[PDB]
Design a binder for this molecule. Structure first.
Ligand SMILES: Cc1cn([C@H]2C[C@H](O)[C@@H](COP(=O)(O)O)O2)c(=O)[nH]c1=O
Ligand SMILES: Cc1cn([C@H]2C[C@H](O)[C@@H](COP(=O)(O)O)O2)c(=O)[nH]c1=O
Lengths: 202, 202
């Protein structure tokens, strides 16, 4: 497993080796040693998992959790192909307002660790694209907020030549700048404090 | 999410609801609240995950970890279709020697919790079948043992109309009864002690 720090502070791309034999293939998308090496502590305790399947051209996001309590996440693409996007919405972060992207496919699988307090989006590049997540806390509707992924300010890589397929909640989402003004974005210091508790060495 | 106790003591089948919209489908394969209700405590700390893809007719198993240290697992089928099999190989268990099976498909997805000490096997019923696991301990080759899945004493449902595709290590595995005589099986009491430590609420 190789680890590469993303441009959004604390976000990490992991590239597992793919093992093949006559029966099929194997990857180990999360591995404690590689994770600790890159992050400095183990994964959060897992509260919930997600299996999301999307049609080509679906854009989901930008999703974040009200912080506190916040949510950290670990995601990979288990089928199909996605452009995964991390957006740093943590006020005070050295990388506030920046994003980075990871192409997730089946030939060269990559997983991403999303710190507490960041935003997540993706676009499905193929039908039957599965995004598989581990979360640090169960999804609670009242704590789950959204920002506009289509915000021309951000210029996210979410246009693939079809009209995007977007939910109501994502379509009407306010922009990053509007959320900031309203006091709705996570604070970087607070986010890192929570994150260090979640990923503390037992 | 609904939970159902399997015939192997402590093994549990979870049935998440399938949510659908214009974008696709969503299931939540692992959910802490349902898990805690059924098991009595939260999932183990996740040491490692697995993404395994198999051709139709592959049979993997029966696999178990030397106990101690042992491994508990949580598994679901993220693509394709599998017959998932849990085998109680824990000497002293009230359900020793029994197995149970769960059909894992895309239409009515099911996840299974495998206690410490039990054996696991599955048969892939479609090409490109993906089994997705969370593990309590990282895989260590020297601790990963096998038992014969073809054992006539068990009658596992593993031939589906094509010549089974089996690894050499699985093909030459000894039977459950032989492994018991050789002293190679997990002990139930020990397994339960490990399990209680892993899944403690504190
Ligand atoms: C991702 C997720 C969504 N949901 C629900 C909330 C919404 O009613 C619906 C779609 O959510 P979404 O707008 O975040 O895609 O599914 C959960 O209950 N738990 C989850 O983990
Ligand atoms: C399942 C698994 C297998 N392996 C290795 C051991 C073997 O050399 C090969 C196949 O293992 P298997 O016979 O248990 O399927 O993959 C790992 O290193 N980590 C894992 O988690």
């Amino acid at each position: 497993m190789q680890a590469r720090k993303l441009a959004v502070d604390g976000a990490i791309e992991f590239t597992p080796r793919v093992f093949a034999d006559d029966r099929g293939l194997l990857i180990l998308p999360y591995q404690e040693e590689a994770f600790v090496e890159a992050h400095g502590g183990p994964l959060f305790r897992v509260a919930q998992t997600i299996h999301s399947m999307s049609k080509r051209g679906v854009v989901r996001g930008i999703h974040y959790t009200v912080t506190p309590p916040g949510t950290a996440k670990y995601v990979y693409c288990a089928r199909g192909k996605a452009m995964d996007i991390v957006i740093d919405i943590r006020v005070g972060s050295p990388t506030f307002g920046q994003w980075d992207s990871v192409l997730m496919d089946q030939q060269d699988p990559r997983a991403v660790y999303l710190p507490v307090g960041v935003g997540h989006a993706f676009v499905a590049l193929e039908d039957d694209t599965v995004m598989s997540y581990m979360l640090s806390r169960s999804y609670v509707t009242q704590d789950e907020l959204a920002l506009s992924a289509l915000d021309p300010a951000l210029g996210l890589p979410i246009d693939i030549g079809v009209e995007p397929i977007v939910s109501d909640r994502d379509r009407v989402a306010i922009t990053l700048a509007e959320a900031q003004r309203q006091g709705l974005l996570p604070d970087y210091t607070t986010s890192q404090e929570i994150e260090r508790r979640l990923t503390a060495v037992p």
